[PDB]
Design a protein around this ligand. Structure first.
Ligand SMILES: Nc1ncnc2c1c(OC(F)F)nn2[C@@H]1O[C@H](COS(=O)(=O)NC(=O)[C@@H](N)Cc2ccc(O)cc2)[C@@H](O)[C@H]1O
Ligand SMILES: Nc1ncnc2c1c(OC(F)F)nn2[C@@H]1O[C@H](COS(=O)(=O)NC(=O)[C@@H](N)Cc2ccc(O)cc2)[C@@H](O)[C@H]1O
Ligand SMILES: [Cl-]
Ligand SMILES: [Cl-]
Ligand SMILES: [Mg+2]
Ligand SMILES: [Mg+2]
Lengths: 346, 356
């Protein structure tokens, strides 16, 4: 039993280090000690070009989970994007974007057996009685104001026009968790309200198989007053360099620093190091083997923001290269990327 | 002319008697245009299976359906089983709800309706046959209206703002609104308490620039037996005559019913004579002992209204005749549930449920 318990403890510690919040790691240990494959999932509204957090950052946690034997589902939330007034509600364009998402994921670390690309409308229509019965029962269990606390999962707020779709959307997202038999909800922190709703629903219905909530931190925006104007998976080297140099990067400050966050959350996990290239008069080249020294050097002003930007832009361009090469060589992926670049984001 | 004059003449007489069994028709101009089609018009009413059926949903409904089906319409009975589940009927138990729905169909099949142009559709069954079409409608309707506009439809569920409002009370009117388009309904023929969601569907047509808008042909609410009961309902105790009540129960309920002398306002006994008995028989034959003035036949409603308001018809005489005619109209239903052994046990089974 020793070797069986040793690895699970170090698995949990590596998971909790790359995850911002885990609702009860004690339950996660119970599921990690199961003689089966766990079901993890994340969901995505095909609303346009893919954010760097949904591709490069996503591959880091996904490969950590799948390499231990877990299955990770990519929930292509096409009906949710239509419900959330994305892509002018055109479901035809949404499915085009969804196909572009699969091509990006397959070229940035998710061309794997333990990854599944599931379309929301396709899977719901296969078992509609089961899915919609879930949605109905969930709506019967919570009041309006409790459901309006989940408005953040759509990028909305209670200060604007609150449409009935904003009540229906979280009922369906809560239903997906049971419909997909999810063990671990691996979504961003901005999704935790509806994730806490599914656990609350289990207590109401006396369901003992409660999903574990494993939230990953939100990558801040490139500009100043931003916490969630961004790097896209299709940006060329010229675009990444232009966006990084104009980005917000306050000296000695780590919070809401999108440049440091890219180095801490994407670059460092992907390389197990951070090679900072500088001129000698600015401190010279230095190889960082721990985030503790990187944080210390930036807070104390050892790393100037200009030097951090140039290295972050260089690393991001290295990580985006297999994506660029897939879209420049796979002609069917190129035409798919060229077509979705013609859409108005709503 | 020849055929043009005769054709336009029968359309206006079909329009005139349809509006007679109607409390409010949202745009009669639209209804006359609908009748100008050689195809059958699709009308529908929906029912939550939530226990015993009372006469407003059985006797009163058969009169309206017979008038529509004999005038070139097809009528759909929409068994709203999932809606009853969504509204916490029969303790939400979907198995009990489906048995009540089967009991409803047994009553309607023995109410004396022309079954050739009548269909019974289960919501859950039809939705699951075309779930992509149906739920796409629900989703698009939810995108079109805000929560405050949707909460104006709470009365279609018998709900109020003063109580805790669950999300089911937002999804319910979105689904009922979608039913109208899912069934390709030309005429929403429901009670007037349903008009808010019927107005929502017409507003949805204007949002989506849909030119085929449904006609709202609402019927009045049959009042309850006691004074002040504006609507007969099983949620209001002692207010209803049920389709399974015996002659003794009907007589006993009507004798204690509210029937103020010389006034028809808020008079439920007079309402049963007007909305149920008179349209069924096309006359009201008031039977009386010679001690009390002998029999008298009323061929129009005003003749009946005039004799009652001025005191020529005593309340007891009106109550005795209303009880007798209702007992006669319920007789084919009683015959079915006493001769059809399978229907009798079905009635016995649903009466063992607890109403919620
Ligand atoms: N800057 C950032 N940093 C770190 N993580 C980030 C972002 C970011 O930026 C953004 F604003 F564009 N998204 N995410 C994360 O990526 C994923 C998809 O995002 S989404 O398209 O918006 N879908 C939704 O929100 C969900 N309602 C869709 C959904 C629907 C049904 C389900 O059963 C499950 C999910 C979710 O996990 C998000 O948390
Ligand atoms: N006393 C009375 N006099 C005259 N008409 C009366 C009543 C009465 O009494 C009551 F309180 F018990 N109901 N009705 C009328 O009968 C019908 C069913 O009634 S219900 O079971 O409550 N279904 C609902 O309310 C609807 N949400 C169900 C529904 C769901 C989806 C649809 O696509 C369409 C409909 C509707 O037409 C009602 O208006
Ligand atoms: Cl199913
Ligand atoms: Cl379909
Ligand atoms: Mg795969
Ligand atoms: Mg038939």
């Amino acid at each position: 039993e020793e070797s069986k318990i040793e690895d699970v403890d170090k698995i949990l510690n590596d998971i909790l280090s790359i995850s911002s919040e885990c609702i009860q790691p004690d339950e996660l240990r119970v599921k990690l000690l199961l003689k089966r494959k766990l079901i993890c999932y994340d969901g995505f509204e095909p609303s346009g070009r893919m954010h760097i957090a949904q591709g490069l950052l996503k591959s880091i946690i996904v490969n950590k989970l799948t390499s231990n034997g877990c299955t990770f589902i990519f929930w292509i939330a096409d009906w949710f994007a239509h419900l959330n007034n994305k892509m002018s509600g055109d479901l035809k364009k949404i499915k085009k974007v969804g196909s572009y998402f699969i091509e990006v994921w397959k070229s940035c670390g998710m061309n794997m057996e333990n990854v599944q690309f599931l379309w929301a409308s396709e899977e719901i229509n296969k078992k509609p009685n089961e899915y919609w019965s879930l949605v109905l029962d969930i709506s019967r269990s919570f009041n309006i104001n409790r459901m309006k606390r989940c408005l953040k999962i759509m990028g909305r707020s209670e200060g604007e026009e609150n449409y009935c779709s904003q009540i229906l959307y979280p009922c369906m997202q809560c239903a997906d968790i049971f419909f997909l038999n999810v063990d671990i909800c691996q979504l961003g922190i901005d999704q935790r309200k509806v994730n806490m709703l599914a656990r609350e629903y289990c207590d109401i219905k006396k369901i003992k198989k409660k999903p574990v909530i494993l939230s990953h931190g939100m990558l801040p925006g490139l500009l100043e007053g931003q916490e969630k104007s961004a790097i896209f998976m299709d940006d060329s080297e010229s675009d990444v360099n232009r966006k990084i140099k104009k980005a917000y990067c306050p000296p000695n400050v780590i919070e809401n620093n999108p440049i440091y966050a890219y180095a801490k959350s994407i670059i460092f996990p992907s390389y197990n190091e951070f090679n900072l290239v500088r001129k000698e008069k600015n401190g010279g080249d230095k190889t960082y083997y721990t985030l503790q020294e990187l944080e210390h050097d930036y807070v104390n002003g050892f790393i100037h923001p200009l030097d951090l930007k140039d290295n972050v832009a260089m690393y991001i361009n290295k990580l985006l290269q297999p994506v660029r090469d897939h879209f420049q060589n796979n002609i069917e992926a190129k035409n798919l990327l060229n077509e979705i670049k013609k859409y108005k984001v709503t």
